[PDB]
């Protein structure tokens, strides 16, 4: 039932002084200081968390290999994939409507 103390000079509970209790091979109760929890990146359009990418603090992403930071397809990051399919369909149909609109206007109205 031994009580514990901090190990640094900051005595205040200020969302950056985070501790957890561990038991040591010497049979004592100490305090171990830990960092914050990373947040998962979100999608560009819908805003949901992308699957297959870990959640870390912004500095740790510089030490990890490329294949662990992306997904092998067009717009691998920042887009969920459901939104990617919508882009493909929407882009194709819009251009098709442009072809018929220009032929109709150029032919049926400039025949004179």
Interface with Zn ion (CB under 5 A): 43, 45-46, 80, 83
> Binding partner of residue 77 among Zn ion, RNA, none, CB under 5 to 8 Å per kind?
RNA
Contact status: 90 vs RNA (CB under 7 A):
no
Choose from RNA, Zn ion, none: what does 83 bind? Cβ within 5-8 Å by kind: Zn ion
Asked whether position 83 contacts RNA by CB under 7 A, the answer is: no
46-49 contact pairs (CB < 8 A, 24+) = 46/80, 46/82, 46/83, 48/80
Is there a binding annotation on residue 50? no
Find the shortest distance in angstroms from Cβ 112 to RNA: 40
Does 3 bind RNA (CB under 7 A)? Our answer is: yes
Piece in contact with RNA (CB under 7 A), picked from 46-54, 89-97, 98-106: 46-54
Residue ranges for the known binding site for Zn(2+) are 43, 45-46, 80, 83
């Amino acid at each position: 039932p031994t009580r514990v103390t901090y190990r640094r000079r900051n005595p205040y509970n200020t969302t950056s002084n985070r501790t957890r209790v561990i038991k040591t091979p010497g049979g004592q109760l100490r305090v171990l200081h830990i960092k914050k929890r990373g947040t998962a990146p979100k999608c560009g359009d819908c805003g949901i968390k992308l699957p297959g990418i870990p959640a870390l603090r912004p500095r740790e992403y510089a030490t990890i290999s490329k294949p662990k930071k992306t997904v092998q397809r067009a717009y691998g990051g920042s887009r969920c994939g459901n939104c990617v399919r919508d882009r493909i369909i929407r882009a194709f149909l819009i251009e098709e409507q442009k072809i018929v609109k220009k032929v109709l206007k150029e032919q049926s109205q400039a025949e004179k």
